[PDB]
Structure formats: C-alpha cells, structure tokens
C-alpha cells in the first residue's frame, strides 16, 4: 500500500478447477455350460464370487 | 559267605524308549478324510477367475 503512493484499486477474483471424469466402465462376462454344470463334482458359484472379486 | 541266599532284584517296570513329540498331523489340514473313506486318489480342483474387460 506504501509503494502504491497510498492508492488501492479492486482486483477481479478468479477460480481454478479439475474434472472428475467417471470415464471407467469395466465388465465381467462368462458362460457356465449346462453340460459342465451337470458333469462337475460340485457348485460352480465360486466363479460368480471370482468375477465379483476381479472387479 | 552267602553264595546262595543274597538275591538279585529286577524292577517290575520296563524303561519306555524316549522319542520325539509328534506334531505335524495336528497342524496340517484333515478335511479330505471325509471324502477319502474309499479309493486311492483324491482330486482337488481350483477356480481360475474370469478376466475384467474394458
């Protein structure tokens, strides 16, 4: 304020910004064959849990 | 001297042999003893996970 004589004038304010882009879209997609579902030793629902764990 | 009337003595207990404490059969998994009631092989299978696609 002292170097300015004793003058003051008002500045314009401004902003910065960043974009959160929601640009990721990812998928799981697999077949459970009915012949395999019948012929295997037990439940295949562990593959639905594996798909969820992968995402 | 008493060549005939002084006994020799035996202990009635055998000394049992000193042997290692067994531990491993209590530490490993026993779950397949349910299925292994017959046959000479157990097959165990594991999941391969589905791949995430973009």
TrEMBL record, chain B:
<protein>
    <submittedName>
        <fullName>Major capsid protein</fullName>
    </submittedName>
</protein>
């Amino acid at each position: 304020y002292k170097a300015a004589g004793r003058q003051t004038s008002a500045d314009a304010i401004s902003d910065t910004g960043v974009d959160l882009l929601i640009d990721q879209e990812k998928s799981i997609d697999f077949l459970v064959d009915d012949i395999d579902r019948v012929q295997v030793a037990g439940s295949l629902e562990a593959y639905t849990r594996a798909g969820a764990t992968a995402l | 001297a008493f060549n005939n009337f002084i006994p020799e003595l035996w202990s009635d207990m055998l000394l049992e042999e000193w042997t290692a404490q067994t531990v491993f059969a209590n530490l490993v998994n026993r779950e397949y003893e349910g299925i292994a009631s017959k046959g000479n092989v157990v097959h165990i299978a594991g999941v391969v996970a589905p791949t995430v696609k973009d």
